[PDB]
Write a protein that binds this DNA or RNA. Structure first.
Ligand SMILES: [Ca+2]
Ligand SMILES: [Ca+2]
Ligand SMILES: [Ca+2]
Ligand SMILES: [Ca+2]
Ligand SMILES: [Ca+2]
Ligand SMILES: [Ca+2]
Ligand SMILES: [Ca+2]
Ligand SMILES: [Ca+2]
Ligand SMILES: [Ca+2]
Ligand SMILES: [Ca+2]
Ligand SMILES: [K+]
Lengths: 87, 61, 86, 99, 56, 98
DNA sequence: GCTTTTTTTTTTCACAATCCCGGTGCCGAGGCCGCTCAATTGGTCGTAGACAGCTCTAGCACCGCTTAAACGCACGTACGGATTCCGTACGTGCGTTTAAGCGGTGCTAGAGCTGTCTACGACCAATTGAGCGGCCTCGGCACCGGGATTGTGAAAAAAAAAAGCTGCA
DNA sequence: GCTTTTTTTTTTCACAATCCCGGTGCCGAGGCCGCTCAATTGGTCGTAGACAGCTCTAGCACCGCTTAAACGCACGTACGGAATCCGTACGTGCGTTTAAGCGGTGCTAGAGCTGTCTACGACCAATTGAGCGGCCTCGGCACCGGGATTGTGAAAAAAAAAAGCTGCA
C-alpha cells in the first residue's frame, strides 16, 4: 500500500478570499487583482525557507518526522521567532 | 580570488578594501552571506536608477 | 461677508477673461479662475461654475479649445479680432 | 431600492472584524497539504507533528499580515488606496528580503 | 500586570494570548524588547490608517 | 555665459562619489559630535582614534544605505526628489521606527 | 491648399569636465630575525553515544454528513493615472569666509602588563523537599437565540449660497 | 434689486450589522497526591581575578600656516502637486457548487526510552617548531602636471508638423 503523496498544486488552495482576509487584518482596504498571485509566490518562498531549515533540523536529529521544535528553531534562525510552541 | 582579479583589472598589485567590496557585491552569493556586513573603506557599486538618467543617446568617438 | 456678487454673465466673464490676455497659446482654466476673483465679484461655487460654462461654450461653438481635453486645457475665442476690448 | 453599501464600507468592516480576532485565516487542510508538497522537495516520506504544521501556519499568517501592513504604507505613500504588487516588492526590498 | 488588565477590560477571568499581545504591543518598551517576536494566537492592534476612513 | 542644466552636475556627483571610497563627512566635526553624544553617558571619556573612525565608517555606511532606500520610496511615489516622508517610510519598513 | 506659429530634430557649434598618460616622493608591505608559546606526541582514564531492542504515542488513512465558505457572474462606482497648467523650491555658479587638516611639539592620563595571595566556585557525596506526571472536579467561557442599539445610505424637505437679468452710477 | 436655479444643509425613514444579555453544557484550569530526582548542605581543593605597583603608549592640547571646502547670494528651470477627466477595475451582493471540518474508527510507523559496552575525547607532561613582535628595505602607489577624448547645451537649420483658415466641389 504505502499511499504516495500526490503533488496536487496546493498553492492554489491558498484562496483569494483567504489572501483578502490576511490583508484585512493587515489593514488593507482595496486590493489589485494582481495581488492574490504575487502573494502566493511570496508565501511559497517563505514556506520553502522555513521548511528547508526545519527539515535540516529533522535530518540532523535522524528523525522521519518534522517536530514543532524543528519549526521553531527554523523560525529563530530566519529571525522570525515564534512564542507558544516550545523552546 | 575574486578580489585579486579586481585588483588586477585596476592595474594594481595589492588588494585593498574596495577590491574586496567589488568582489563581494558582484557575487550574488557572497553578497547574501555578507549582507548585513559593512566593509570599512569599500564604498558602493556604481548604480543609478534609470528614471534619474536623461534618456538621450548620442555617442562616443 | 459679501452678500451677493454684482457681476456680468459667465459666457461674457470668460470671454472678457481671454480678451485681457493676448496669448496665442490661449487662456487656461486656472488663468480664467484667477481673473474672475481678482477683477470681478463672484461666488464660492465659482470655480465649478467656470468649469460648467466652458462645457456649454465648447458644445455651442462659441469658445475654441487650443491644447487639451474638456475643462482641463487652454482655450480662446472663435475670432481674436474684436471691436473695442482687444 | 434593495440595500447596498458603498464600496469601501464592507471592506472597512472586514478590517475591523479581523483586527479584533485571532483565528487563523487560511483554511487548515489546504495549508497542511501545501506544507507537505513543499516538504517533498527536500525530503521524501516525512511526517509532521500537527503542532509543527500549526506553528508554520501561525508563522506564515503573521508574516503575511505583517507584510500587508508594510504593503499598505507603500501604496498610501504613492497616493493610493489599492495595494499592488510593486508595493509588496518595495516593502520586501526595503525589508532586505529581496535583492 | 499588563496582560491581566487587558483580560479585565475584556471581561475575562483568564489571560489568553491576545491579552498578552495587547499588553505587549501597547507598551512602548515591551514592544521594543519583543519587536521581532511573534505571539501565536495574538492577532494585531486595531489600526486603520486615517486616509482609509470615510470623509464624514 | 556657460551653465549646466539642473540635474546634470547632480548625476556627475553621483558618478563621482559611487566611484570612490573616502569618508564624506568632515572628520573633526564628526569627532566633536561623537564626544558630545558620549557626554550624556559618562563624563570625561577618552576615545581611541580608531574608535572614532570605526563609528564614522559605520554612520556613513548606514546613511548611504538609507539614502538608497529613501530614493526608492521617492521614485515609488513618482518623484525624483527625496523628502522626509521617504526617509520615514524607509525607516518604518526597516523596523527602526514605530 | 498656403502661411503662420509651434514643435522637433538634427547639426553644428563651442567647451567644460573626465580620462589617460608620463614623470616624481615616501610609507608601509613583506620578509628576516630572535625567541616564546601553543600545537604535538604519546600516554592514561572515564563516560558519551551508537546500537539494539522494546514500548506505546500519535501521525496517517479512511468515511460520510452538514453546511460554511469558495466560486462565478451581474452590476456600477470611485479609483487610478494620463494630461495639462502654475508657482516656486530647488540646482547651478560665483565670490567671500571659514575652519579643516596638516605637521610639529609638549604633557601626562590611563591602558595594560607583572607578580602575589586568597576568596570563591568546582567538585563530591549524602540528604530530603520542591516540582514532576497523573488524576479528578466544577466554574469560566464558547456558543446560542432574541432584543436593543448603532451606523449607513437613500430620498425629501428647508436654509442659505449664486445664476442671469433689471436699469445705471 | 428681482425671480429662478443650485448647493448646502438638515431631516426622516428603512435596513442591516454589531452589541449585549441570560441560558446552556462541556472541558480544561487548577489543585491535590505520591513519588522521584534535582536542589541543598557541608566538606576539600585549586586557581581565577582583584589588587598594587610599574612601564610607556597614545590620547590630548596647543599652535600657526595654507587652502580646500563651506557659505551666502543671485537667478531661473524643472519639478512637485493640484485639478480635470475618462474608462473600467475592483467591491458588493446574489445564486450555485465545492470541500473543509467534524467526530469517529482502525492500523502502524517511528519517537523516545533503557541497558550495554567501548571508541574516542579530556587531560597530562614532556618536546619543539610554527607564529609572534620588532625592525629594515625598497617597490608600489599616490601625487602632480599637462596633454588628449566625451558628453552637454545652445543655437540654428531643417524638417516636419501642426495650427489657423479657406477655396472649391
Ligand atoms: Ca591520542
Ligand atoms: Ca545514556
Ligand atoms: Ca499539573
Ligand atoms: Ca466548551
Ligand atoms: Ca476550578
Ligand atoms: Ca508647488
Ligand atoms: Ca509631474
Ligand atoms: Ca529506532
Ligand atoms: Ca562511540
Ligand atoms: Ca610581521
Ligand atoms: K594610552
Amino acid at each position: 500500500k504505502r499511499h504516495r503523496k500526490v503533488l496536487r498544486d496546493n498553492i492554489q488552495g491558498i484562496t483569494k478570499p483567504a489572501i483578502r482576509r490576511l490583508a484585512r487584518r493587515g489593514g488593507v482596504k482595496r486590493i489589485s487583482g494582481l495581488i492574490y498571485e504575487e502573494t502566493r509566490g511570496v508565501l511559497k518562498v517563505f514556506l520553502e525557507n522555513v521548511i528547508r531549515d526545519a527539515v535540516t533540523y529533522t535530518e540532523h536529529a535522524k528523525r522521519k518526522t518534522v517536530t514543532a521544535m524543528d519549526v521553531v528553531y527554523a523560525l529563530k534562525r530566519q529571525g522570525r521567532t515564534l512564542y507558544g510552541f516550545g523552546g | 580570488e575574486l578580489a585579486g582579479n579586481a585588483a588586477r583589472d585596476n592595474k594594481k598589485t595589492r588588494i585593498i578594501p574596495r577590491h574586496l567590496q567589488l568582489a563581494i557585491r558582484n557575487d550574488e552569493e557572497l553578497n547574501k552571506l555578507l549582507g548585513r556586513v559593512t566593509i570599512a573603506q569599500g564604498g558602493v557599486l556604481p548604480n543609478i536608477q534609470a528614471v534619474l538618467l536623461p534618456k538621450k543617446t548620442e555617442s562616443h568617438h | 461677508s459679501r452678500r451677493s456678487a454684482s457681476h456680468p454673465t459667465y459666457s461674457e466673464m470668460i470671454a472678457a477673461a481671454i480678451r485681457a490676455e493676448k496669448s496665442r497659446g490661449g487662456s487656461s482654466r486656472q488663468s480664467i479662475q484667477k481673473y474672475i476673483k481678482s477683477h470681478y465679484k463672484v461666488g464660492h461655487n465659482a470655480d465649478l461654475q467656470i468649469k460648467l460654462s466652458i462645457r456649454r461654450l465648447l458644445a455651442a461653438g462659441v469658445l475654441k479649445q487650443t491644447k487639451g481635453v474638456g475643462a482641463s486645457g487652454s482655450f480662446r475665442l472663435a475670432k481674436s479680432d474684436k471691436a473695442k476690448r482687444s | 431600492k434593495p440595500h447596498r453599501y458603498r464600496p469601501g464600507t464592507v471592506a472597512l468592516r472586514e478590517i475591523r472584524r479581523y483586527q479584533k480576532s485571532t483565528e487563523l485565516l487560511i483554511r487548515k487542510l489546504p495549508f497542511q497539504r501545501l506544507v507537505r508538497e513543499i516538504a517533498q522537495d527536500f525530503k521524501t516520506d516525512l511526517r509532521f507533528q500537527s503542532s509543527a504544521v500549526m506553528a508554520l501556519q501561525e508563522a506564515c499568517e503573521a508574516y503575511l499580515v505583517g507584510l500587508f501592513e508594510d504593503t499598505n504604507l507603500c501604496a498610501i505613500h504613492a497616493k493610493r488606496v489599492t495595494i499592488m504588487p510593486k508595493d509588496i516588492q518595495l516593502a520586501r526590498r526595503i525589508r532586505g528580503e529581496r535583492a
